[PDB]
Motif scaffolding. Structure first.
Motif, PDB file in Angstrom:
ATOM      1  N   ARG A  66     -78.415   2.873 -21.775  1.00 62.64           N
ATOM      2  CA  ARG A  66     -77.343   3.825 -22.616  1.00 62.64           C
ATOM      3  C   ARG A  66     -78.273   4.531 -23.687  1.00 62.64           C
ATOM      4  NH1 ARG A  66     -75.603   1.362 -27.880  1.00 62.64           N
ATOM      5  NH2 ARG A  66     -76.188  -0.627 -28.082  1.00 62.64           N
ATOM      6  N   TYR A 110     -70.132  -0.168 -24.159  1.00 62.12           N
ATOM      7  CA  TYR A 110     -71.427   0.154 -24.274  1.00 62.12           C
ATOM      8  C   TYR A 110     -71.970   0.165 -22.837  1.00 62.12           C
ATOM      9  CZ  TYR A 110     -72.409  -0.957 -29.172  1.00 62.12           C
ATOM     10  OH  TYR A 110     -72.421  -0.770 -30.590  1.00 62.12           O
ATOM     11  N   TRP A 154     -76.177   2.481 -32.559  1.00 63.45           N
ATOM     12  CA  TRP A 154     -76.802   3.644 -31.935  1.00 63.45           C
ATOM     13  C   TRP A 154     -78.163   4.067 -32.470  1.00 63.45           C
ATOM     14  CZ3 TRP A 154     -75.540   4.837 -27.021  1.00 63.45           C
ATOM     15  CH2 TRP A 154     -74.201   4.462 -26.536  1.00 63.45           C
ATOM     16  N   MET A 204     -70.269   0.587 -33.947  1.00 67.92           N
ATOM     17  CA  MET A 204     -71.204   0.507 -32.838  1.00 67.92           C
ATOM     18  C   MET A 204     -72.728   0.692 -33.166  1.00 67.92           C
ATOM     19  SD  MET A 204     -69.301   2.509 -29.905  1.00 67.92           S
ATOM     20  CE  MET A 204     -69.091   4.265 -30.831  1.00 67.92           C
ATOM     21  N   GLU A 214     -76.032  -7.462 -26.439  1.00 70.71           N
ATOM     22  CA  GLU A 214     -75.189  -6.417 -26.971  1.00 70.71           C
ATOM     23  C   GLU A 214     -74.345  -6.858 -28.161  1.00 70.71           C
ATOM     24  OE1 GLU A 214     -75.735  -2.454 -24.985  1.00 70.71           O
ATOM     25  OE2 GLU A 214     -75.762  -3.301 -26.972  1.00 70.71           O
TER      26      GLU A 214
END
Ligand SMILES: [Mg+2]
Ligand SMILES: [Mg+2]
Ligand SMILES: [Mg+2]
Ligand SMILES: [Mg+2]
Lengths: 195, 212, 222, 125, 196, 232, 204, 226, 195, 196
Positions: free
Chosen positions: J29, F186, F219, F217, H139
């Motif tokens: 990101r 990431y 996103w 993941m 994260e």
């Protein structure tokens, strides 16, 4: 070191050299003799980088003394000056060059003539009636150019030298603590103890 | 750093301070800046601590080998020259050394040589080296005589370091005194500058500028 | 351009008692703002009742300790298993350090033990080999935080006897091993509060005539 | 263009009167009544919401204004003049005090700053 | 410079442009960047011309001496000799070499040796200043076990684009085909590849 | 003195109750260009050691050859080369550490950061780090480069001190390692999705996993993000 | 060259029970040269005390500046400025020279005349406030002071105990700094009495 | 310094550590890094501490005046636009790196802003020397539709990662929660996991230990009457 | 310029300043007076960068003389020194700072006390019993620290000053060509013409 | 960064990656590099984020004020305002901007404004660090008057390769479609475009 002067008169060579040794901030000594006797009738004064001056001078002295013993003979001032020049010319392309300027005052017993040689750290040799190294010539040469005569006596040479030192003491910013004066003639080397 | 050494009627006085700094930071106040090369020879330490320690200890080994081989005490001239010739070999490499090699022999008498890392070797009567050298010289020059007594000479050396320790930020801690005779050196104690300053101020009447 | 040196932080402390000696150091290893290890021993038992630490650049510190341990081994081989005295070890380390005078071991070295009269001894070195016997010496990152404290609490500097008002100093009475360890722990606790490179753990090596003993204490991990 | 009125428009008359100030006070006299009363544990300020039209939403017109969290203001006279003074008063409380001392000005000093602004409109060109 | 080597069904093909520049001046517009170090082991050179010529000459010497003693060397062996020179002298060299060769046992092989002196065995490789502009095209259009004609087209098209965008690349497109049949040289001129 | 050209990013590792785990992605970067996509940066030595290397790839390939030569050399005149006198992780590390420090001392370093992971003869876990400066250290978790900043914090939540090691299973450790690799993908611009993972266990031996991918993941939340402030 | 270490000197401030203390050395130098042993670095504006370390010309300039500003404050406010308010004034004044700063390390100390609460604060050269409950340090021996204060300090010390603690913190820190020392002063501050004591220390 | 910002169901939460440093030295062990621009718009700053404070207060001052002028509660986009235009003008010389969070009539917002004047939008952000440690945690555990309790937990966990792993960060965790339709709740020292242990010894001196030369009363009072 | 010394005794302030002016290679002058009378009982000596020294000194002189005329009153030495400090403190953050160090010797007629102020080019002011600028203090302060008394006569101050100058002449590398000495007391300013 | 704008039959489409780096660290990101300066005039930003944000904000202001006075501005006019800022402040800016818009009179238009502040009207444009790797691919695969679906595929494939090779590019692929029908936002995730 600082001021080294030389003058060749009728029958002798006179070398005058400052007495001060300064390490940056302080004057560590005021009676230093910046000269070495290479042979009975040959004297060398010196000035340049600290340490290298004395190291070079004593190295030359040792070599000339060695020659004197081996041959039982005193080399001419010209021969000594050529030997010294070669050593400095060799040194300038070394890893760490001798940063030393010299005057060689000698009396040639064969020719019965005084001789003064000026050699800088590059190995630049010239025979002169009078010479100096550093800034000394800038203050003194105009006086020497005026008064110098090839037939001067030793006493007249000393008087002209006094005038040079007086001009140095007037216009030079640095206090060089006077000079030690030595005379080289047919009888050898002697020091003028009152100057 | 402040160190001095001077020749007089009774031999040599060596006096040094004790402070070591790394910038503004005072690393030590108990540093030995006089080195006992041997029972007859002393060396002072200015510049690189290691360079002075290492090579003057080494010098002691060379002096010992000399007297073993020649069956005679080494001259101060010869001892000082062994050190100066050595550091001259290293010239350009970055040694930092300012030392006074002090000794008293029969043939020479009391003798001091200033030896330096750029190859300088000077014989002399009075030497002062370090960040506080100018302060010590002032006291030395105005009070020095050849015919000083051992007692007065010791005090002069002590008082001269004190002058430097006061004014020079990088000098202080304590004063180490030595007296060099023909039969060898004699240690004359460690003197805390803090206590010494007040003592001298009162007894001498000096340092009126400072409130005590 | 390649930089052969680094800074692994750390702080060490050596104190010489009357008949003992301690050499302490934090167990944290760092580069920049990262922690490499929370427990990476820094003070070593080198044999012959000698303890050693070379603080600063860890690679140079490990190499020096390794070479000195080797020197102890060869001293025994060459001199009929003679015990290496602390003063002899000190002089030997000077030569190891000065051997790299023109490419130094980037460390501050301290060794501790007992002298030949059984009294406590600590020796302190600079990176190129200059050394001194000392009573008290902190080294490394937080040395400037610790030493003033030690001058005050070990040597009683600036402390005078009450009622005399500066005329009589506080007398320098001898400290026990328990008293010294208190000062060591408090030194490192204080250092951990105010220095970012100090923390994680404290390892103390104590040297007596009976041998070498270890003590470990936790330190704050932030 | 350029403001070529660099001279005072308020001046002393032979009798020593500053006419424009007197006339400004006359405009205040015509204005709707407002008052203030100080108590031991507080202060009250009040006025009438004289609505110009019943179609107008008089809640959108604030005659009583917060200058700082601990200072308020009310007026009598010309409303628009009041509105711009409130803007200047709020700003000067920050620029000449809060951004310097990290706290709001005391009542008397904020009043002093507002007073200075009003004085300058009596002498400036 | 734009250079590449591509393995295919019958072996491997090397490809290159012919431009050599000194700043903005084209010092040579018909350069041969495909160099022979052994009969069926060639290389494409990028970086310092002096360095890559010196290296290739030394390798050719090493493989000639190898062959005299041990017989035909492998393409892997040739790449290893290249690597040894490039890696051990990395401080004094600026060389980016692609090594391509044909064995009968191993068939077509390609090794790339970038600046550092590392070795990477690949199905195909691209290098030189012009290669940057065709990473996308080559990745999308490469297939394994292509025919000779397909591989020629792939290299022709790829270097055509590299030449189009890179000022340091240009001239003719040279190619060398390495198969069991032998060694074939090809050349393609601007009027051909510019209209693709 | 040099500069790294083709480089490999983070290597991450940790100890668990019966052994060690180590992981590293399969990328060889050329500056910002993601040039080589099939680079193996975990190199097993025997059946008890795995050396993970980051930094300059040409130097990695050199080290790889040194290790291969080390195995050959150890087998010479050694009847117990596959038994009592087999190479230990500690032998392999100390050798590399010696080389790295010697090379930095000649001012010609191997531009790498290395983690040696393995299990000793007596079953003890081995995990130690060495880099281009010759600096060495050990910890329950070790990571190089970006892994040091992002992986260690996560791995240290599982094993925060020595006493946490016996409490940590291989399933929990592998899970933590795999998550850390996702986090690095990431957030590290010089990382790839593909990676290798190796487990050295005192009971089950060496398990080498190739062609692993970062999965699961997140996103989707990107669709709602618009502009850089005021844009709707 | 480094303006913050040309002249040298240190300041330290501590809080106690219903009291504060602020102390400083007396040295002024030109690098290695000791110039003055009477250069006091603590000033006061009413009951608010300000210690300033760093470049001496800026120390003098800032004292004159804050005397100026606090005098006008008093005339307008009709009351003496408080420590909390003065702290903001120092911060404001320093940051207005953000790109041409005074090379100083100020320290504020005082007791709020209304709440009686002890107050100390410190700043960097551009005005960032450090409002610590315990102690504030500044100067060329700030590292040494941090070390002394961290170990010697304990909360709620009585005035006469706080005096010993802060004095010893300063003294021993100064003796490990070449550019600090040459005398020292300690202020012990209570709500309506302030005592000032000059300390005896080594003069090297 | 470690600072984070986390969006949740009905609002946003911001958190920070409490260590302020002077190089490797810890100046203050309990610094307040959470600053108020307006009642319901808070921000946390990293970089040059005087710049992060000065810029918050300036924009905070102008935001207050704007709110008064417009008779509207301040918006986060206004604080952001004013901050970035100020910072851009000074071309990074004002070393302020901020995470700005708040609620207003428009909704809940979370932004980051860098010293050169660039801004970013996000659901979770981190800043400072401990930002990588913090982001590793974010994260790993962030998800869509977090509750208030989950977000406070995640935020403080992210700061903890910085406290333990970053040398530039330490001591305590401060938190501020800004929920829609509620007062913003500032939670100073929400976590306190770094209390210093009791010392082995008391260093209280005997009275009279320090040598004194002179004593004198200092006149702090004004000139007296009569 | 080079050496400027100051000493405050019982009833006067004595300022000693070197006479040499050196421009690099040559000593251009050996009788330069590095001082300006600011008011009848206030004298300022100075040393620093060429040109800026005299420009600054004369600028200060003009300002104090202006004040004297406007108020028909002589400012106290303290007031003058504060004015001078502010000017130098202002100057140090200017486009091109005055590189000037000064000593201000004044007799305060109100307090009947001599006063000596030392101010460097940064605006660093200190009141001292004796002071100097440059390297002068390094050679002289150890002598002054020893011999100085606050109750010294003017004659004793001059004798202590002679000892300081002698030490400077011995250990300083530069020839500063002696000093001009001036005394400031209740009767004003006068020059000692034999020193 | 990898950004591009492509004209097609019904208008124009802007495309971009979402990666923002500070060195090797990905600071964001999920960045949105497609910015709106007017209803149907958008831009792709590359270079200094601070600079390009400041510029875009100023342009948005200029076009808002233009619209209030003179009605809807042309894409050419928007590009001119961008250029004026970039050219006159070239010494203090690092900005590479692609401007794309839809008129009914002029339809889809694309203008690229590189570092110097020059303007270039093109059928399509690519920019950013990742664009270098797709000059060859884009040149070979671009056609005029493509359909919406073809253009989406072209951009998707192109930025996929740019992301593949450029470390400074990555994340999601964002797209904005500008036609007479309106404004449509698209997003494509890694699992989609990486397998292309
Ligand atoms: Mg001192
Ligand atoms: Mg810590
Ligand atoms: Mg001191
Ligand atoms: Mg990518």
């Amino acid at each position: 070191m600082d001021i080294i002067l030389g003058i060749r008169v009728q029958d002798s060579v006179i070398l005058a050299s400052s007495k001060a040794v300064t390490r940056g901030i302080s004057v560590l000594k005021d009676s230093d003799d910046k000269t070495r006797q290479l042979s009975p009738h040959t004297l060398m004064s010196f000035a340049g980088e600290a340490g290298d001056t004395v190291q070079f001078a004593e190295y030359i002295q040792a070599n000339i003394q060695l020659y004197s013993i081996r041959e039982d003979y005193e080399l001419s001032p010209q021969a000594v000056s050529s030997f010294v020049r070669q050593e400095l010319a060799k040194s300038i392309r070394s890893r760490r060059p001798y940063q030393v300027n010299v005057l060689i005052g000698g009396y040639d017993k064969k020719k019965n003539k005084p001789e003064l040689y000026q050699i800088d750290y590059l190995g630049t040799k010239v025979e002169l009636p009078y010479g100096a190294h550093g800034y000394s010539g800038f203050y003194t040469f105009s006086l020497l150019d005026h008064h110098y005569r090839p037939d001067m006596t030793t006493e007249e040479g000393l008087d002209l030298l006094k005038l040079c030192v007086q001009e140095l003491e007037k216009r030079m910013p640095m206090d060089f603590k006077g000079v030690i004066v030595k005379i080289v003639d047919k009888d050898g080397i002697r020091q003028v103890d009152d100057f | 750093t402040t160190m001095l050494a001077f020749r007089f009627q009774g031999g040599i006085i060596v006096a040094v301070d004790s402070r070591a700094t790394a910038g503004n930071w005072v690393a030590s106040q108990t540093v030995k800046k006089v080195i006992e090369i041997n029972p007859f020879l002393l060396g002072t330490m200015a510049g690189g601590a290691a360079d002075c320690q290492f090579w003057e200890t080494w010098l002691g080994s060379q002096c010992r080998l000399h007297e073993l081989r020649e069956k005679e005490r080494i001259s101060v001239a010869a001892a000082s020259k062994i050190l100066s010739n050595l550091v001259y070999q290293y010239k350009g490499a970055g040694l930092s050394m300012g030392t006074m090699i002090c000794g008293y022999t029969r043939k020479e008498g009391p003798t001091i040589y200033y030896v330096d890392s750029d190859g300088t070797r000077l014989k002399g009567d009075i030497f002062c080296v370090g960040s506080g050298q100018t302060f010590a010289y002032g006291v030395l020059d105005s009070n020095y005589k050849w015919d000083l007594s051992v007692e007065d000479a010791l005090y002069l050396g002590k008082r001269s370091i004190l002058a430097a320790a006061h004014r020079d930020a990088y000098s202080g801690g304590s004063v180490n005194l030595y007296h060099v005779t023909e039969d060898g050196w004699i240690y004359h104690g460690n003197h805390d500058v803090g206590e010494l300053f007040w003592k001298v101020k009162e007894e001498e009447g000096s340092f009126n500028n400072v409130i005590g | 351009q390649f930089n052969p040196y680094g800074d692994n932080g750390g702080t060490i402390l050596g104190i010489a008692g009357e008949d003992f000696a301690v050499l302490a150091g934090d167990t944290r290893n760092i580069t920049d703002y990262s922690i490499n290890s929370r427990y990476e021993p820094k003070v070593f038992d080198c044999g012959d009742n000698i303890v050693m630490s070379a603080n600063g650049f860890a690679a140079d510190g490990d190499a020096l300790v390794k070479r000195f341990k080797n020197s102890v081994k060869w001293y025994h081989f060459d001199h009929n298993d003679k015990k290496l005295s602390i003063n002899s070890a000190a002089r030997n380390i000077q030569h190891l350090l000065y051997g790299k005078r023109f490419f130094p071991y980037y460390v501050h070295t301290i060794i501790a033990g007992l002298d030949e009269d059984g009294k406590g001894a600590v020796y302190s070195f600079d990176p190129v080999g200059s050394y001194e016997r000392e009573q008290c010496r902190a080294g490394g990152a937080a040395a400037s935080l610790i030493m003033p404290f030690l001058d005050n609490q070990v040597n009683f500097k600036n402390q005078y006897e009450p009622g005399t008002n500066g005329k009589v100093k506080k007398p320098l009475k001898y400290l026990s091993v328990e008293e010294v360890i208190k000062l060591v722990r408090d030194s490192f606790t204080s250092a951990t509060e105010r220095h970012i490179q100090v923390g994680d753990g404290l390892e103390i090596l104590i040297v007596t005539k009976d041998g070498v003993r270890k003590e470990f204490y936790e330190l704050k991990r932030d | 263009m350029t403001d070529r009125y660099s001279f005072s428009l308020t001046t002393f008359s032979p009798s020593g009167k500053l006419g424009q100030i007197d006339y400004a006070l006359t405009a205040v006299k015509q204005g709707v009544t407002s008052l203030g009363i100080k108590a031991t544990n507080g202060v009250v300020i009040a006025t009438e919401k004289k609505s110009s039209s019943p179609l107008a939403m008089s809640e959108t017109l604030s005659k009583v204004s917060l200058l700082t969290p601990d200072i308020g203001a009310v007026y009598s006279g010309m409303g628009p003049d009041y509105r711009v003074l409130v803007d200047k008063s709020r700003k000067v409380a920050h620029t000449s005090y809060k951004r310097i001392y990290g706290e709001y000005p005391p009542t008397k000093l904020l009043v002093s700053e507002v007073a200075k602004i009003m004085q300058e409109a009596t002498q400036s060109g | 410079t734009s250079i590449m080597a591509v393995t295919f069904k019958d072996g491997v093909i090397l490809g290159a442009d012919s431009r050599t520049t000194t700043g903005a001046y084209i010092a040579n517009r018909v350069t041969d960047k495909l160099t022979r170090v052994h009969d069926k082991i060639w290389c494409c050179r990028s970086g310092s011309a002096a360095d890559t010529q010196a290296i290739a000459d030394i390798v050719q010497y090493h493989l000639e001496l190898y062959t005299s003693q041990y017989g035909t060397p492998s393409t892997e062996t040739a790449a290893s000799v290249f690597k040894e020179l490039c890696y051990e002298n990395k401080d004094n060299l600026t060389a980016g070499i692609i090594v391509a060769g044909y064995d009968d046992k191993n068939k077509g092989e390609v090794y790339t040796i970038p600046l550092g002196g590392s070795v990477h065995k690949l199905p195909y490789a691209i290098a030189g200043s012009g290669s940057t502009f065709i990473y996308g095209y080559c990745d999308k259009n490469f297939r394994e076990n292509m025919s000779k004609e397909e591989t020629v087209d792939f290299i022709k098209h790829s270097l055509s684009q590299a030449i189009k965008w890179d000022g340091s690349s240009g001239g003719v497109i040279r190619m060398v085909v390495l198969t069991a049949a032998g060694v074939e040289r090809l050349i393609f001129y601007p009027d051909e590849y510019e209209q693709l | 003195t040099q500069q790294p050209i083709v480089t490999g990013t983070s290597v991450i590792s940790m100890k668990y109750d019966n052994g060690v785990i180590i992981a590293a992605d399969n990328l060889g970067s050329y500056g910002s260009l993601l040039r080589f996509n099939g680079v193996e940066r975990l190199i097993p030595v025997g059946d008890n050691t795995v050396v993970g290397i980051s930094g300059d790839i040409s130097d990695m390939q050199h080290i790889e050859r040194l290790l291969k030569d080390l195995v050959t050399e150890n087998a010479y005149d050694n009847p117990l080369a596959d038994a009592e006198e087999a190479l230990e992780p500690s032998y392999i590390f100390e050798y590399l550490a010696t080389v790295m420090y010697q090379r930095r001392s000649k001012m010609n370093p191997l531009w790498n950061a290395i983690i040696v992971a393995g299990v000793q003869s007596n079953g003890d876990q081995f995990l130690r780090y060495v880099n281009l400066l010759g600096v060495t250290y050990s910890s329950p978790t070790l990571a190089t480069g970006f892994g040091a900043h992002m992986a260690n914090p996560l791995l240290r939540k599982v094993v925060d001190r020595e006493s946490d090691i016996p409490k940590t299973t291989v399933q929990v450790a592998e899970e933590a390692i795999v998550n850390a690799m996702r986090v690095l993908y990431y957030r590290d611009a010089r990382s790839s999705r593909n990676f290798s993972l190796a487990i050295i266990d005192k009971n089950t031996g060496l398990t080498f996993k190739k062609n692993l991918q970062v999965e699961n993941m997140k996103w989707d939340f990107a669709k709602d993000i618009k502009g850089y402030g005021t844009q709707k | 060259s480094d303006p913050s270490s040309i002249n040298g000197g240190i300041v330290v401030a501590m809080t106690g029970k219903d009291c504060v203390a602020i102390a400083c050395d007396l040295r002024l130098g030109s690098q290695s040269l000791g110039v003055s042993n009477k250069f006091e670095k603590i000033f006061h504006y009413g009951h608010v005390f300000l210690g300033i370390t760093g470049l001496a010309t800026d120390v003098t300039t800032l004292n004159e500046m804050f005397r100026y500003k606090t005098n006008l404050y008093k005339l307008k406010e009709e009351r003496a400025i408080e420590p909390e308010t003065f702290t903001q004034l120092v911060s404001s004044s320093l940051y207005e020279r953000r790109f041409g700063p005074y090379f100083v390390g100020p320290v504020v100390a005082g007791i709020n005349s209304k709440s009686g609460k002890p107050f100390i604060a410190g700043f960097d050269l551009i005005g960032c406030i450090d409002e610590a409950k315990d102690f504030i340090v500044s100067g060329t021996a700030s590292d040494q002071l941090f070390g002394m204060c961290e170990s010697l300090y304990e909360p709620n010390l009585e005035p006469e105990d706080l005096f010993e603690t802060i004095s010893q913190a300063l003294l021993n820190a100064a003796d490990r700094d070449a550019l600090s020392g040459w005398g020292a002063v300690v202020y012990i501050i209570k709500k309506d009495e302030v005592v000032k004591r000059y300390l005896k220390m080594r003069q090297d | 310094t470690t600072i984070v910002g986390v969006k949740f169901n009905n609002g946003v939460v911001i958190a920070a550590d409490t260590r302020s440093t002077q190089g490797p030295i810890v100046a203050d062990k309990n610094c307040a890094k959470l600053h108020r621009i307006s009642p319901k718009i808070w921000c946390a700053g990293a970089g040059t501490a005087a710049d992060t404070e000065a810029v918050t207060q300036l924009i905070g001052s102008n935001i207050e005046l704007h709110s008064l002028y417009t008779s509207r509660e301040p918006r986060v986009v206004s604080a952001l636009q004013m901050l970035k235009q100020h910072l851009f003008k000074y071309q990074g010389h004002i070393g302020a790196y901020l995470i700005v969070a708040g609620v207003d009539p428009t909704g809940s917002h979370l932004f980051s802003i860098h010293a050169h004047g660039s801004t970013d939008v996000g659901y979770y952000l981190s800043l400072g020397s401990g930002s990588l440690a913090a982001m590793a945690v974010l994260e790993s555990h962030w998800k869509q539709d977090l509750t208030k309790e989950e977000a406070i937990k995640l935020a403080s966990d992210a700061i903890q990662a910085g406290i333990w792993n970053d040398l530039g960060s330490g001591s305590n965790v401060d938190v501020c929660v800004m929920e829609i339709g509620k007062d913003a709740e500032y939670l100073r020292n929400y976590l306190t996991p770094n209390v210093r242990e009791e010392k082995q010894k008391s260093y209280k001196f005997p009275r009279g230990t320090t040598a004194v030369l002179k004593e004198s009363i200092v006149n702090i009072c004004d000139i007296q009457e009569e």
